[PDB]
Amino acid sequence: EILEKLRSIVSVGDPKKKYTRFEKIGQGASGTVYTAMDVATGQEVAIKQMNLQQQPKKELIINEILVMRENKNPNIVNYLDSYLVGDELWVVMEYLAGGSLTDVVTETCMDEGQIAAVCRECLQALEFLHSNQVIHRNIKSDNILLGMDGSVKLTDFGFCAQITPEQSKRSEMVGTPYWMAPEVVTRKAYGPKVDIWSLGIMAIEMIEGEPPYLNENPLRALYLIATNGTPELQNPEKLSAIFRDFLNRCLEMDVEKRGSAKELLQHQFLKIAKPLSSLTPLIAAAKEATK
Ligand SMILES: N[C@H]1CC[C@@H](CNc2nccc(Nc3ncc(C4CC4)s3)n2)C[C@@H]1c1cccc(Cl)c1
């Protein structure tokens, strides 16, 4: 009954009177997401509402709130507060007007400059987390949020892990199959570089619209990751050499040879990044496409 630890972390007081103008903007396995407005303050917020029954290990909920409140950063969606509403947990975060990267990758064609701009900002989030001994473990386009200024922010700490010098590696088979690094899929001990792999897969989303093997069922994709290793692009000839190089460094099978987030921030690919204002036309296109 670590529900007591969860009960001591959360704020008390009715969120249903602190916040108004509730609108469902999202579903998800982890719960439903609503927008709302702080009754007093006017601030727009996103609230994730999670059924405590839905989650069998309430230990992960605790971990999610702590990591988020302890690791604030400009490239991470800001945690504001949390509340228990009966058997439902509400997490309140800053609302980022814009959209999901998923909408952009499925509905637009991104140029290398735009892709490099997104990758740089995500690598900055990862550098910060990994330096704070946190592995995200669920990097994908669905967890990247884009601001109306082209701000890029990472969210979702539902699956993350804290490591320590004593225990530098994890062994849970956690993530979303198509984005999971081979060492994770094959139950080897793994470290922060699983996030770099997932980032590589997200770069393939930005190129091709989908992670490798998405037409296949999840179990089949796990088999394909275990057997193929480094995925191949549909049309690699369409990419610059330096982009292909960046991809190769993100998607190295040899963990020790795979780029760290720090190493990758100095890659040549990132030097072609467009300014973040370059992403706002993608956001406009995606909103129009998903009317
Ligand atoms: N699957 C994802 C789809 C995209 C986004 C919802 N859609 C949307 N659309 C337009 C603006 C906007 N802005 C937001 N600012 C702050 C937000 C915090 C994350 C809540 S969201 N979100 C989030 C959602 C998500 C993230 C993490 C866990 C789960 Cl379970 C679900």
PDB file of C-alpha atoms and ligand atoms in Angstrom:
ATOM      1  CA  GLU A   1       0.000   0.000   0.000  1.00  0.00           C
ATOM      2  CA  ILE A   2       2.334   2.660  -1.419  1.00  0.00           C
ATOM      3  CA  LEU A   3      -0.941   4.405  -2.263  1.00  0.00           C
ATOM      4  CA  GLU A   4      -0.082   6.236   1.007  1.00  0.00           C
ATOM      5  CA  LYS A   5       3.110   7.577  -0.567  1.00  0.00           C
ATOM      6  CA  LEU A   6       1.075   8.714  -3.590  1.00  0.00           C
ATOM      7  CA  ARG A   7      -1.508  10.320  -1.305  1.00  0.00           C
ATOM      8  CA  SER A   8       1.251  12.342   0.436  1.00  0.00           C
ATOM      9  CA  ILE A   9       2.747  13.636  -2.858  1.00  0.00           C
ATOM     10  CA  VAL A  10      -0.422  15.058  -4.381  1.00  0.00           C
ATOM     11  CA  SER A  11      -2.043  18.402  -3.593  1.00  0.00           C
ATOM     12  CA  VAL A  12      -5.449  18.412  -1.934  1.00  0.00           C
ATOM     13  CA  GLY A  13      -8.374  20.578  -3.006  1.00  0.00           C
ATOM     14  CA  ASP A  14     -10.947  20.148  -5.771  1.00  0.00           C
ATOM     15  CA  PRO A  15      -9.302  20.444  -9.196  1.00  0.00           C
ATOM     16  CA  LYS A  16     -12.922  20.641 -10.466  1.00  0.00           C
ATOM     17  CA  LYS A  17     -13.158  24.121  -8.897  1.00  0.00           C
ATOM     18  CA  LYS A  18      -9.567  25.290  -9.508  1.00  0.00           C
ATOM     19  CA  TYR A  19      -9.997  24.579 -13.254  1.00  0.00           C
ATOM     20  CA  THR A  20     -12.827  25.072 -15.751  1.00  0.00           C
ATOM     21  CA  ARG A  21     -13.675  24.863 -19.474  1.00  0.00           C
ATOM     22  CA  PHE A  22     -12.785  21.147 -19.777  1.00  0.00           C
ATOM     23  CA  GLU A  23     -12.410  19.745 -23.333  1.00  0.00           C
ATOM     24  CA  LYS A  24     -11.186  16.222 -24.200  1.00  0.00           C
ATOM     25  CA  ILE A  25      -8.214  16.591 -26.605  1.00  0.00           C
ATOM     26  CA  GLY A  26      -6.729  13.132 -26.280  1.00  0.00           C
ATOM     27  CA  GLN A  27      -7.088   9.516 -25.336  1.00  0.00           C
ATOM     28  CA  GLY A  28      -4.222   7.116 -24.644  1.00  0.00           C
ATOM     29  CA  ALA A  29      -3.408   3.908 -22.779  1.00  0.00           C
ATOM     30  CA  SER A  30      -2.208   5.971 -19.802  1.00  0.00           C
ATOM     31  CA  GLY A  31      -5.464   7.939 -19.679  1.00  0.00           C
ATOM     32  CA  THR A  32      -7.537  10.781 -21.120  1.00  0.00           C
ATOM     33  CA  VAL A  33      -6.169  14.283 -21.627  1.00  0.00           C
ATOM     34  CA  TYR A  34      -8.224  17.428 -21.241  1.00  0.00           C
ATOM     35  CA  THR A  35      -7.541  21.084 -21.758  1.00  0.00           C
ATOM     36  CA  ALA A  36      -8.853  23.514 -19.179  1.00  0.00           C
ATOM     37  CA  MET A  37      -8.353  26.963 -17.682  1.00  0.00           C
ATOM     38  CA  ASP A  38      -7.261  27.840 -14.150  1.00  0.00           C
ATOM     39  CA  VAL A  39     -10.375  29.567 -12.813  1.00  0.00           C
ATOM     40  CA  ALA A  40      -8.157  32.071 -10.981  1.00  0.00           C
ATOM     41  CA  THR A  41      -5.091  32.867 -13.158  1.00  0.00           C
ATOM     42  CA  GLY A  42      -6.613  32.294 -16.623  1.00  0.00           C
ATOM     43  CA  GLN A  43      -3.711  29.950 -17.554  1.00  0.00           C
ATOM     44  CA  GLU A  44      -4.434  27.162 -20.050  1.00  0.00           C
ATOM     45  CA  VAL A  45      -3.519  23.686 -18.813  1.00  0.00           C
ATOM     46  CA  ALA A  46      -3.520  20.110 -19.991  1.00  0.00           C
ATOM     47  CA  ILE A  47      -4.738  17.611 -17.450  1.00  0.00           C
ATOM     48  CA  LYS A  48      -4.002  13.943 -17.799  1.00  0.00           C
ATOM     49  CA  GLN A  49      -6.583  11.863 -15.916  1.00  0.00           C
ATOM     50  CA  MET A  50      -5.446   8.301 -15.125  1.00  0.00           C
ATOM     51  CA  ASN A  51      -7.560   5.531 -13.608  1.00  0.00           C
ATOM     52  CA  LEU A  52      -5.574   3.967 -10.749  1.00  0.00           C
ATOM     53  CA  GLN A  53      -7.190   0.597 -11.565  1.00  0.00           C
ATOM     54  CA  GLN A  54      -5.818   0.869 -15.129  1.00  0.00           C
ATOM     55  CA  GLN A  55      -2.279   0.854 -13.673  1.00  0.00           C
ATOM     56  CA  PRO A  56      -1.464  -2.342 -11.682  1.00  0.00           C
ATOM     57  CA  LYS A  57       1.873  -1.031 -10.334  1.00  0.00           C
ATOM     58  CA  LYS A  58       1.136   2.312  -8.609  1.00  0.00           C
ATOM     59  CA  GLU A  59       4.905   2.563  -8.035  1.00  0.00           C
ATOM     60  CA  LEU A  60       5.190   3.869 -11.642  1.00  0.00           C
ATOM     61  CA  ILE A  61       2.691   6.663 -11.037  1.00  0.00           C
ATOM     62  CA  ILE A  62       4.789   7.897  -8.093  1.00  0.00           C
ATOM     63  CA  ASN A  63       7.932   7.740 -10.232  1.00  0.00           C
ATOM     64  CA  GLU A  64       6.197   9.690 -12.974  1.00  0.00           C
ATOM     65  CA  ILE A  65       5.275  12.661 -10.738  1.00  0.00           C
ATOM     66  CA  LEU A  66       8.637  12.802  -8.968  1.00  0.00           C
ATOM     67  CA  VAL A  67      10.712  12.695 -12.140  1.00  0.00           C
ATOM     68  CA  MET A  68       8.607  15.387 -13.721  1.00  0.00           C
ATOM     69  CA  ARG A  69       8.600  17.736 -10.759  1.00  0.00           C
ATOM     70  CA  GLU A  70      12.328  17.162 -10.249  1.00  0.00           C
ATOM     71  CA  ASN A  71      13.478  17.628 -13.846  1.00  0.00           C
ATOM     72  CA  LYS A  72      12.041  20.891 -15.111  1.00  0.00           C
ATOM     73  CA  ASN A  73      13.559  22.097 -18.359  1.00  0.00           C
ATOM     74  CA  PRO A  74      12.663  24.317 -21.377  1.00  0.00           C
ATOM     75  CA  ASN A  75      12.454  21.252 -23.692  1.00  0.00           C
ATOM     76  CA  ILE A  76      10.193  19.297 -21.286  1.00  0.00           C
ATOM     77  CA  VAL A  77       6.488  19.993 -20.794  1.00  0.00           C
ATOM     78  CA  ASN A  78       6.152  21.718 -17.390  1.00  0.00           C
ATOM     79  CA  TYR A  79       4.528  19.788 -14.512  1.00  0.00           C
ATOM     80  CA  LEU A  80       2.217  22.125 -12.522  1.00  0.00           C
ATOM     81  CA  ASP A  81       0.406  19.955  -9.932  1.00  0.00           C
ATOM     82  CA  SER A  82      -1.331  16.669  -9.191  1.00  0.00           C
ATOM     83  CA  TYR A  83      -4.550  15.608  -7.421  1.00  0.00           C
ATOM     84  CA  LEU A  84      -6.301  12.377  -6.510  1.00  0.00           C
ATOM     85  CA  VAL A  85      -9.947  12.455  -7.631  1.00  0.00           C
ATOM     86  CA  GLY A  86     -11.328   9.286  -6.080  1.00  0.00           C
ATOM     87  CA  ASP A  87      -9.716   6.345  -7.892  1.00  0.00           C
ATOM     88  CA  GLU A  88      -8.456   8.742 -10.614  1.00  0.00           C
ATOM     89  CA  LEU A  89      -5.149  10.625 -10.605  1.00  0.00           C
ATOM     90  CA  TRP A  90      -5.024  14.027 -12.317  1.00  0.00           C
ATOM     91  CA  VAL A  91      -1.711  15.463 -13.487  1.00  0.00           C
ATOM     92  CA  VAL A  92      -1.763  19.103 -14.520  1.00  0.00           C
ATOM     93  CA  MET A  93       0.750  20.402 -17.000  1.00  0.00           C
ATOM     94  CA  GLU A  94       1.374  23.561 -19.003  1.00  0.00           C
ATOM     95  CA  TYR A  95      -0.698  23.548 -22.194  1.00  0.00           C
ATOM     96  CA  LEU A  96       1.330  23.900 -25.367  1.00  0.00           C
ATOM     97  CA  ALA A  97      -0.832  25.347 -28.123  1.00  0.00           C
ATOM     98  CA  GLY A  98       0.386  23.793 -31.310  1.00  0.00           C
ATOM     99  CA  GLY A  99       0.197  20.144 -32.051  1.00  0.00           C
ATOM    100  CA  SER A 100       1.693  16.713 -31.819  1.00  0.00           C
ATOM    101  CA  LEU A 101       4.739  15.893 -33.957  1.00  0.00           C
ATOM    102  CA  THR A 102       2.712  12.806 -35.018  1.00  0.00           C
ATOM    103  CA  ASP A 103       0.249  15.027 -36.884  1.00  0.00           C
ATOM    104  CA  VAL A 104       3.143  16.795 -38.618  1.00  0.00           C
ATOM    105  CA  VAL A 105       4.931  13.560 -39.628  1.00  0.00           C
ATOM    106  CA  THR A 106       1.780  11.883 -40.897  1.00  0.00           C
ATOM    107  CA  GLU A 107       0.407  14.908 -42.802  1.00  0.00           C
ATOM    108  CA  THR A 108       3.435  16.914 -44.070  1.00  0.00           C
ATOM    109  CA  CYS A 109       6.808  16.496 -45.706  1.00  0.00           C
ATOM    110  CA  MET A 110       9.593  17.835 -43.520  1.00  0.00           C
ATOM    111  CA  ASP A 111      12.849  19.127 -45.001  1.00  0.00           C
ATOM    112  CA  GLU A 112      16.220  18.168 -43.523  1.00  0.00           C
ATOM    113  CA  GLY A 113      16.556  21.612 -41.915  1.00  0.00           C
ATOM    114  CA  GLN A 114      13.260  21.174 -40.082  1.00  0.00           C
ATOM    115  CA  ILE A 115      14.113  17.630 -39.097  1.00  0.00           C
ATOM    116  CA  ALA A 116      17.526  18.741 -37.760  1.00  0.00           C
ATOM    117  CA  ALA A 117      15.805  21.492 -35.736  1.00  0.00           C
ATOM    118  CA  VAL A 118      13.446  18.984 -34.109  1.00  0.00           C
ATOM    119  CA  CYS A 119      16.261  16.477 -33.467  1.00  0.00           C
ATOM    120  CA  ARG A 120      18.447  19.128 -31.825  1.00  0.00           C
ATOM    121  CA  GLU A 121      15.713  20.163 -29.375  1.00  0.00           C
ATOM    122  CA  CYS A 122      14.921  16.546 -28.466  1.00  0.00           C
ATOM    123  CA  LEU A 123      18.613  15.788 -28.022  1.00  0.00           C
ATOM    124  CA  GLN A 124      18.768  18.787 -25.623  1.00  0.00           C
ATOM    125  CA  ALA A 125      15.943  17.271 -23.524  1.00  0.00           C
ATOM    126  CA  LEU A 126      17.668  13.874 -23.570  1.00  0.00           C
ATOM    127  CA  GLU A 127      21.081  15.334 -22.649  1.00  0.00           C
ATOM    128  CA  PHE A 128      19.490  17.004 -19.646  1.00  0.00           C
ATOM    129  CA  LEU A 129      17.547  13.873 -18.528  1.00  0.00           C
ATOM    130  CA  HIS A 130      20.471  11.494 -19.000  1.00  0.00           C
ATOM    131  CA  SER A 131      22.771  13.844 -17.051  1.00  0.00           C
ATOM    132  CA  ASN A 132      20.121  13.637 -14.307  1.00  0.00           C
ATOM    133  CA  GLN A 133      20.163   9.794 -14.435  1.00  0.00           C
ATOM    134  CA  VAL A 134      16.723   9.477 -16.030  1.00  0.00           C
ATOM    135  CA  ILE A 135      15.970   7.252 -19.029  1.00  0.00           C
ATOM    136  CA  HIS A 136      12.730   8.180 -20.776  1.00  0.00           C
ATOM    137  CA  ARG A 137      12.212   4.840 -22.522  1.00  0.00           C
ATOM    138  CA  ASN A 138       9.215   5.999 -24.599  1.00  0.00           C
ATOM    139  CA  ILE A 139      10.616   8.463 -27.158  1.00  0.00           C
ATOM    140  CA  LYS A 140       8.356   8.762 -30.224  1.00  0.00           C
ATOM    141  CA  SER A 141       6.607  11.516 -32.247  1.00  0.00           C
ATOM    142  CA  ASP A 142       3.500  11.070 -30.112  1.00  0.00           C
ATOM    143  CA  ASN A 143       5.365  12.418 -27.061  1.00  0.00           C
ATOM    144  CA  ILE A 144       6.757  15.496 -28.840  1.00  0.00           C
ATOM    145  CA  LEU A 145       4.718  18.685 -28.597  1.00  0.00           C
ATOM    146  CA  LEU A 146       5.208  21.728 -30.796  1.00  0.00           C
ATOM    147  CA  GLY A 147       4.521  25.302 -29.659  1.00  0.00           C
ATOM    148  CA  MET A 148       2.910  27.973 -31.846  1.00  0.00           C
ATOM    149  CA  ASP A 149       6.379  29.598 -31.686  1.00  0.00           C
ATOM    150  CA  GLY A 150       7.928  26.333 -32.884  1.00  0.00           C
ATOM    151  CA  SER A 151       8.936  25.400 -29.313  1.00  0.00           C
ATOM    152  CA  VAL A 152       9.631  21.668 -29.162  1.00  0.00           C
ATOM    153  CA  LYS A 153       8.912  19.824 -25.916  1.00  0.00           C
ATOM    154  CA  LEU A 154       9.091  16.245 -24.675  1.00  0.00           C
ATOM    155  CA  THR A 155       6.344  14.753 -22.509  1.00  0.00           C
ATOM    156  CA  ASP A 156       5.162  11.471 -20.911  1.00  0.00           C
ATOM    157  CA  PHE A 157       7.216  10.194 -17.949  1.00  0.00           C
ATOM    158  CA  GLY A 158       4.905   7.225 -17.448  1.00  0.00           C
ATOM    159  CA  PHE A 159       7.594   4.706 -18.444  1.00  0.00           C
ATOM    160  CA  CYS A 160      10.814   6.425 -17.404  1.00  0.00           C
ATOM    161  CA  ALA A 161      13.519   4.919 -15.168  1.00  0.00           C
ATOM    162  CA  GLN A 162      15.912   6.479 -12.666  1.00  0.00           C
ATOM    163  CA  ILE A 163      19.361   4.950 -12.663  1.00  0.00           C
ATOM    164  CA  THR A 164      22.239   5.260 -10.188  1.00  0.00           C
ATOM    165  CA  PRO A 165      26.014   4.527 -10.270  1.00  0.00           C
ATOM    166  CA  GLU A 166      25.112   1.466  -8.157  1.00  0.00           C
ATOM    167  CA  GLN A 167      22.489   0.328 -10.693  1.00  0.00           C
ATOM    168  CA  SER A 168      23.451   1.858 -14.031  1.00  0.00           C
ATOM    169  CA  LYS A 169      21.273  -0.442 -16.137  1.00  0.00           C
ATOM    170  CA  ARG A 170      17.660  -1.549 -16.368  1.00  0.00           C
ATOM    171  CA  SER A 171      16.158  -4.798 -17.584  1.00  0.00           C
ATOM    172  CA  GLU A 172      12.384  -4.138 -17.940  1.00  0.00           C
ATOM    173  CA  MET A 173      10.907  -4.649 -21.436  1.00  0.00           C
ATOM    174  CA  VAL A 174       9.246  -1.240 -21.527  1.00  0.00           C
ATOM    175  CA  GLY A 175       8.310   1.094 -24.391  1.00  0.00           C
ATOM    176  CA  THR A 176       6.325   1.094 -27.626  1.00  0.00           C
ATOM    177  CA  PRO A 177       7.411  -1.841 -29.834  1.00  0.00           C
ATOM    178  CA  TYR A 178       8.211  -0.029 -33.103  1.00  0.00           C
ATOM    179  CA  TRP A 179      10.494   2.474 -31.258  1.00  0.00           C
ATOM    180  CA  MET A 180      12.253   0.019 -28.943  1.00  0.00           C
ATOM    181  CA  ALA A 181      15.987  -0.533 -29.131  1.00  0.00           C
ATOM    182  CA  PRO A 182      17.223  -4.114 -29.836  1.00  0.00           C
ATOM    183  CA  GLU A 183      18.865  -4.471 -26.407  1.00  0.00           C
ATOM    184  CA  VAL A 184      15.438  -3.787 -24.872  1.00  0.00           C
ATOM    185  CA  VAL A 185      13.557  -6.155 -27.199  1.00  0.00           C
ATOM    186  CA  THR A 186      16.058  -8.961 -26.494  1.00  0.00           C
ATOM    187  CA  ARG A 187      16.131  -8.472 -22.705  1.00  0.00           C
ATOM    188  CA  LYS A 188      19.735  -7.341 -22.336  1.00  0.00           C
ATOM    189  CA  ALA A 189      20.779  -4.875 -19.643  1.00  0.00           C
ATOM    190  CA  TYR A 190      20.417  -1.372 -21.077  1.00  0.00           C
ATOM    191  CA  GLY A 191      21.210   2.247 -20.416  1.00  0.00           C
ATOM    192  CA  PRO A 192      20.301   5.780 -21.552  1.00  0.00           C
ATOM    193  CA  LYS A 193      21.260   5.051 -25.157  1.00  0.00           C
ATOM    194  CA  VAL A 194      17.943   3.280 -25.684  1.00  0.00           C
ATOM    195  CA  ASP A 195      16.526   6.824 -25.957  1.00  0.00           C
ATOM    196  CA  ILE A 196      18.994   7.636 -28.726  1.00  0.00           C
ATOM    197  CA  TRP A 197      17.812   4.626 -30.684  1.00  0.00           C
ATOM    198  CA  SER A 198      14.187   5.699 -30.252  1.00  0.00           C
ATOM    199  CA  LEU A 199      15.168   9.164 -31.426  1.00  0.00           C
ATOM    200  CA  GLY A 200      16.636   7.555 -34.554  1.00  0.00           C
ATOM    201  CA  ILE A 201      13.310   5.826 -35.105  1.00  0.00           C
ATOM    202  CA  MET A 202      11.523   9.171 -34.662  1.00  0.00           C
ATOM    203  CA  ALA A 203      13.862  10.604 -37.352  1.00  0.00           C
ATOM    204  CA  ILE A 204      12.662   7.842 -39.675  1.00  0.00           C
ATOM    205  CA  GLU A 205       9.067   8.912 -38.864  1.00  0.00           C
ATOM    206  CA  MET A 206       9.969  12.434 -39.949  1.00  0.00           C
ATOM    207  CA  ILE A 207      11.478  11.091 -43.221  1.00  0.00           C
ATOM    208  CA  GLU A 208       8.941   8.382 -44.139  1.00  0.00           C
ATOM    209  CA  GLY A 209       5.809   9.154 -42.050  1.00  0.00           C
ATOM    210  CA  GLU A 210       6.006   5.936 -39.990  1.00  0.00           C
ATOM    211  CA  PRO A 211       8.511   3.956 -37.848  1.00  0.00           C
ATOM    212  CA  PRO A 212       9.780   0.741 -39.581  1.00  0.00           C
ATOM    213  CA  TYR A 213       7.344  -2.217 -39.634  1.00  0.00           C
ATOM    214  CA  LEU A 214       4.228  -0.216 -38.650  1.00  0.00           C
ATOM    215  CA  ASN A 215       2.092  -2.168 -41.128  1.00  0.00           C
ATOM    216  CA  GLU A 216       2.974  -5.268 -39.066  1.00  0.00           C
ATOM    217  CA  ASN A 217       1.426  -6.297 -35.742  1.00  0.00           C
ATOM    218  CA  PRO A 218       3.412  -5.331 -32.569  1.00  0.00           C
ATOM    219  CA  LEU A 219       4.735  -8.836 -31.829  1.00  0.00           C
ATOM    220  CA  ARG A 220       5.919  -9.248 -35.402  1.00  0.00           C
ATOM    221  CA  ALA A 221       7.650  -5.848 -35.168  1.00  0.00           C
ATOM    222  CA  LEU A 222       9.471  -7.037 -32.026  1.00  0.00           C
ATOM    223  CA  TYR A 223      10.647 -10.117 -33.945  1.00  0.00           C
ATOM    224  CA  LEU A 224      11.796  -7.944 -36.870  1.00  0.00           C
ATOM    225  CA  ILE A 225      13.721  -5.597 -34.560  1.00  0.00           C
ATOM    226  CA  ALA A 226      15.391  -8.571 -32.853  1.00  0.00           C
ATOM    227  CA  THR A 227      16.391 -10.133 -36.190  1.00  0.00           C
ATOM    228  CA  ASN A 228      17.199  -7.140 -38.467  1.00  0.00           C
ATOM    229  CA  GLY A 229      18.925  -4.780 -36.039  1.00  0.00           C
ATOM    230  CA  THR A 230      19.509  -1.397 -37.777  1.00  0.00           C
ATOM    231  CA  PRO A 231      16.371  -0.813 -39.892  1.00  0.00           C
ATOM    232  CA  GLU A 232      16.718   0.139 -43.542  1.00  0.00           C
ATOM    233  CA  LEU A 233      15.044   3.135 -45.142  1.00  0.00           C
ATOM    234  CA  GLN A 234      12.681   2.764 -48.098  1.00  0.00           C
ATOM    235  CA  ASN A 235      14.742   5.216 -50.186  1.00  0.00           C
ATOM    236  CA  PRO A 236      18.069   6.050 -48.511  1.00  0.00           C
ATOM    237  CA  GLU A 237      19.312   7.741 -51.687  1.00  0.00           C
ATOM    238  CA  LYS A 238      16.921  10.624 -50.938  1.00  0.00           C
ATOM    239  CA  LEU A 239      18.980  11.728 -47.891  1.00  0.00           C
ATOM    240  CA  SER A 240      22.114  13.838 -47.545  1.00  0.00           C
ATOM    241  CA  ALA A 241      25.263  11.945 -46.562  1.00  0.00           C
ATOM    242  CA  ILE A 242      25.463  13.816 -43.231  1.00  0.00           C
ATOM    243  CA  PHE A 243      21.836  12.963 -42.362  1.00  0.00           C
ATOM    244  CA  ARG A 244      22.454   9.309 -43.262  1.00  0.00           C
ATOM    245  CA  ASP A 245      25.516   9.518 -41.014  1.00  0.00           C
ATOM    246  CA  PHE A 246      23.499  10.959 -38.119  1.00  0.00           C
ATOM    247  CA  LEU A 247      20.927   8.218 -38.510  1.00  0.00           C
ATOM    248  CA  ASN A 248      23.650   5.578 -38.558  1.00  0.00           C
ATOM    249  CA  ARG A 249      25.050   6.950 -35.267  1.00  0.00           C
ATOM    250  CA  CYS A 250      21.601   6.956 -33.575  1.00  0.00           C
ATOM    251  CA  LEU A 251      20.814   3.463 -34.882  1.00  0.00           C
ATOM    252  CA  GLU A 252      24.070   1.605 -34.171  1.00  0.00           C
ATOM    253  CA  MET A 253      23.667  -1.954 -32.895  1.00  0.00           C
ATOM    254  CA  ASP A 254      26.851  -1.654 -30.836  1.00  0.00           C
ATOM    255  CA  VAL A 255      25.672   0.223 -27.751  1.00  0.00           C
ATOM    256  CA  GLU A 256      29.167   1.519 -26.948  1.00  0.00           C
ATOM    257  CA  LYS A 257      29.469   2.871 -30.541  1.00  0.00           C
ATOM    258  CA  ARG A 258      25.980   4.453 -30.523  1.00  0.00           C
ATOM    259  CA  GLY A 259      26.106   8.207 -29.980  1.00  0.00           C
ATOM    260  CA  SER A 260      25.339   9.666 -26.571  1.00  0.00           C
ATOM    261  CA  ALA A 261      23.020  12.677 -26.593  1.00  0.00           C
ATOM    262  CA  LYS A 262      26.008  14.894 -25.755  1.00  0.00           C
ATOM    263  CA  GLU A 263      28.060  13.506 -28.675  1.00  0.00           C
ATOM    264  CA  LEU A 264      25.138  13.828 -31.094  1.00  0.00           C
ATOM    265  CA  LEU A 265      24.489  17.494 -30.240  1.00  0.00           C
ATOM    266  CA  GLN A 266      27.829  18.215 -31.989  1.00  0.00           C
ATOM    267  CA  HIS A 267      26.966  16.246 -35.110  1.00  0.00           C
ATOM    268  CA  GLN A 268      27.251  18.099 -38.449  1.00  0.00           C
ATOM    269  CA  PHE A 269      23.646  17.250 -39.349  1.00  0.00           C
ATOM    270  CA  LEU A 270      22.402  19.612 -36.608  1.00  0.00           C
ATOM    271  CA  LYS A 271      24.369  22.531 -38.110  1.00  0.00           C
ATOM    272  CA  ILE A 272      21.885  22.689 -41.003  1.00  0.00           C
ATOM    273  CA  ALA A 273      19.018  23.182 -38.538  1.00  0.00           C
ATOM    274  CA  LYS A 274      16.515  25.782 -39.570  1.00  0.00           C
ATOM    275  CA  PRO A 275      15.281  28.257 -36.922  1.00  0.00           C
ATOM    276  CA  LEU A 276      12.338  26.955 -34.915  1.00  0.00           C
ATOM    277  CA  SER A 277      10.029  29.464 -36.588  1.00  0.00           C
ATOM    278  CA  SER A 278      10.466  27.144 -39.618  1.00  0.00           C
ATOM    279  CA  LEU A 279       8.199  24.613 -37.909  1.00  0.00           C
ATOM    280  CA  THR A 280       5.130  26.826 -37.596  1.00  0.00           C
ATOM    281  CA  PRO A 281       4.089  26.283 -41.272  1.00  0.00           C
ATOM    282  CA  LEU A 282       4.146  22.500 -40.579  1.00  0.00           C
ATOM    283  CA  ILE A 283       1.855  23.032 -37.611  1.00  0.00           C
ATOM    284  CA  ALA A 284      -0.529  25.071 -39.762  1.00  0.00           C
ATOM    285  CA  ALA A 285      -0.472  22.383 -42.448  1.00  0.00           C
ATOM    286  CA  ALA A 286      -1.169  19.618 -39.892  1.00  0.00           C
ATOM    287  CA  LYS A 287      -4.085  21.507 -38.310  1.00  0.00           C
ATOM    288  CA  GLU A 288      -5.570  22.004 -41.785  1.00  0.00           C
ATOM    289  CA  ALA A 289      -5.034  18.331 -42.695  1.00  0.00           C
ATOM    290  CA  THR A 290      -6.745  17.023 -39.534  1.00  0.00           C
ATOM    291  CA  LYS A 291      -9.579  19.625 -39.556  1.00  0.00           C
TER     292      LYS A 291
HETATM  293  N1  LIG B   1      -1.003  11.238 -27.316  1.00  0.00           N
HETATM  294  C1  LIG B   1      -0.608  12.669 -27.254  1.00  0.00           C
HETATM  295  C2  LIG B   1      -1.241  13.449 -28.403  1.00  0.00           C
HETATM  296  C3  LIG B   1      -0.750  14.886 -28.369  1.00  0.00           C
HETATM  297  C4  LIG B   1      -1.101  15.576 -27.061  1.00  0.00           C
HETATM  298  C5  LIG B   1      -2.598  15.844 -26.978  1.00  0.00           C
HETATM  299  N2  LIG B   1      -3.028  16.696 -28.074  1.00  0.00           N
HETATM  300  C6  LIG B   1      -2.735  18.003 -28.151  1.00  0.00           C
HETATM  301  N3  LIG B   1      -3.233  18.694 -29.204  1.00  0.00           N
HETATM  302  C7  LIG B   1      -2.945  19.998 -29.250  1.00  0.00           C
HETATM  303  C8  LIG B   1      -2.163  20.616 -28.310  1.00  0.00           C
HETATM  304  C9  LIG B   1      -1.701  19.837 -27.247  1.00  0.00           C
HETATM  305  N4  LIG B   1      -0.914  20.420 -26.256  1.00  0.00           N
HETATM  306  C10 LIG B   1      -0.449  19.939 -25.057  1.00  0.00           C
HETATM  307  N5  LIG B   1       0.231  20.709 -24.194  1.00  0.00           N
HETATM  308  C11 LIG B   1       0.601  19.982 -23.083  1.00  0.00           C
HETATM  309  C12 LIG B   1       0.206  18.684 -23.092  1.00  0.00           C
HETATM  310  C13 LIG B   1       0.396  17.651 -22.068  1.00  0.00           C
HETATM  311  C14 LIG B   1       0.779  16.264 -22.469  1.00  0.00           C
HETATM  312  C15 LIG B   1      -0.589  16.530 -21.986  1.00  0.00           C
HETATM  313  S1  LIG B   1      -0.630  18.364 -24.501  1.00  0.00           S
HETATM  314  N6  LIG B   1      -1.981  18.537 -27.168  1.00  0.00           N
HETATM  315  C16 LIG B   1      -0.598  14.762 -25.869  1.00  0.00           C
HETATM  316  C17 LIG B   1      -1.005  13.286 -25.905  1.00  0.00           C
HETATM  317  C18 LIG B   1      -0.474  12.499 -24.726  1.00  0.00           C
HETATM  318  C19 LIG B   1       0.781  12.754 -24.191  1.00  0.00           C
HETATM  319  C20 LIG B   1       1.253  12.022 -23.112  1.00  0.00           C
HETATM  320  C21 LIG B   1       0.485  11.017 -22.556  1.00  0.00           C
HETATM  321  C22 LIG B   1      -0.759  10.762 -23.097  1.00  0.00           C
HETATM  322 CL1  LIG B   1      -1.769   9.501 -22.438  1.00  0.00          CL
HETATM  323  C23 LIG B   1      -1.239  11.486 -24.167  1.00  0.00           C
END
